[PDB]
Amino acid sequence: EREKLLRLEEELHKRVVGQDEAIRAVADAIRRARAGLKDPNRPIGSFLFLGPTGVGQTELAKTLAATLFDTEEAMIRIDMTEYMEKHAVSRLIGAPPGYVGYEEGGQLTEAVRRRPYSVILFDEIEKAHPDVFNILLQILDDGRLTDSHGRTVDFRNTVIILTSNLGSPLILEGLQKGWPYERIRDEVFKVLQQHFRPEFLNRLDEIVVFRPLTKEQIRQIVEIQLSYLRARLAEKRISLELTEAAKDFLAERGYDPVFGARPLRRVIQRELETPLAQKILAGEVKEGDRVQVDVGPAGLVFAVP
Ligand SMILES: CNc1ccccc1C(=O)O[C@H]1C[C@H](n2cnc3c(N)ncnc32)O[C@@H]1COP(=O)(O)OP(=O)(O)O
């Protein structure tokens, strides 16, 4: 779809809040590939996602997968902290013929076989063993791999996203000192040239920087999640309102500067979804009811006028 590409930013922003520069960079690289300006035998895009934990990296990879390939299922997550022990290559691409687990294939290769159109997410690439890192280079160069079975795995329709906890303490200092996004991107690059040779970094479409989320941005994520929960309740014809306090209650608990907004899912589950379920099962919240949710001395409270 043409205008899907032409309006990819607002499309990715349907699910991902803030990180405009990150989304612009991503959207621009997909457009160059789709216009036919880059190598047809390389992947669609290769990115290095930098910044703090839980600020929209996975959610961007998911949204990109849903937007371009119809579903979030078209995202493959390979955590490199599990592939650092040298015997890891056979886990990624398969055990050799005659060895236990040859018929199983490899974690990455089998996933990209049954989903040639997929977004691939590599977590903490610095941790990966040099031999695992060489396989990553082969994807970036050849646009293809050969697994242990000898079957060629195509990567030309994939979008490669690499993440790194490396360089994030610098970008935090960058925003503290008030540097523009431009020079933050340029300063982190020098930190990266100390852990990766420019051989690798030049193959990347963009070096992408994610910021910490502001108070306003956290609210917008809460709203988006309440929007999905609202759809589920609408099937029972149940309306749900939250007071500003109730929205701030969830925002305060669902975000911390260490894990980002990762706690939010189970905060919403523990503080809103589990209590609401109880009220529904008891009979206090019925089909056709409009619920107002407010803050009390113990937690969120539910009332039906
Ligand atoms: C089924 N999933 C959920 C259900 C309820 C609440 C959150 C989630 C969930 O996956 O929530 C995810 C998405 C959400 N989030 C963080 N930053 C942003 C942002 N800038 N824009 C939009 N969302 C963001 O916070 C959670 C963690 O973020 P992440 O992007 O998965 O982590 P990381 O940035 O480390 O990859």
Author numbering: 545 to 849
Extract from the study:
The molecular chaperone ClpB, the bacterial homologue of Hsp104, is a disaggregation machine that provides thermotolerance by resolubilizing and reactivating aggregated proteins in concert with the DnaK (Hsp70) chaperone system. ClpB belongs to the family of AAA+ proteins (ATPases associated with various cellular activities) that comprises a wide range of molecular machines which utilize the energy from ATP hydrolysis to remodel their respective substrates. The AAA+ disaggregation machines Hsp104 and ClpB possess two NBDs per monomer, thus forming double-ring structures with 12 potential ATPase sites in the active hexameric complex. We determined high-resolution X-ray structures in different nucleotide states for one of the motor subunits, namely NBD2, of ClpB and combined the structural analysis with nucleotide-binding kinetics studies.
In order to perturb the open, inactive arrangement of the ClpB NBD2 catalytic site, we replaced the Walker A lysine with a glutamine. To crystallize the mutant ClpB variant NBD2 K601Q, we supplemented the crystallization cocktail with the fluorescently labelled nucleotide MANT-dADP, which has been routinely used for nucleotide-binding studies of ClpB and is known to bind more than 100-fold more strongly to NBD2 than unlabelled ADP. This compensated for the loss in binding affinity owing to the Walker A mutation and allowed us to obtain a nucleotide-bound structure of ClpB NBD2 K601Q. The complex of ClpB NBD2 K601Q and MANT-dADP crystallized from a condition containing PEG 6000 and yielded a different crystal form to that observed previously for the wild-type protein in conditions containing 2-propanol (P212121 instead of P65). The structure was determined by molecular replacement to a resolution of 2.8 Å, showing well defined electron density for the previously unstructured pore-loop region (residues 640–650). The fluorescently labelled MANT-dADP binds at the same position as the unlabelled nucleotides in the structures obtained previously. A domain-motion analysis using DynDom comparing the MANT-dADP-bound form with the ADP-bound form showed that the angle between the domains decreases by 14°. The essential sensor 2 residue Arg806 located on the C-­terminal small domain forms a salt bridge (d = 2.8 Å) with the β-phosphate of the nucleotide. An additional phosphate ion is present in the active site at a distance of 5 Å from the β-­phosphate of the nucleotide, suggesting that we may have captured an ADP + Pi (product-bound) state here. Interestingly, another highly conserved active-site residue, Arg621, adopts a different conformation to that in the structures described previously.
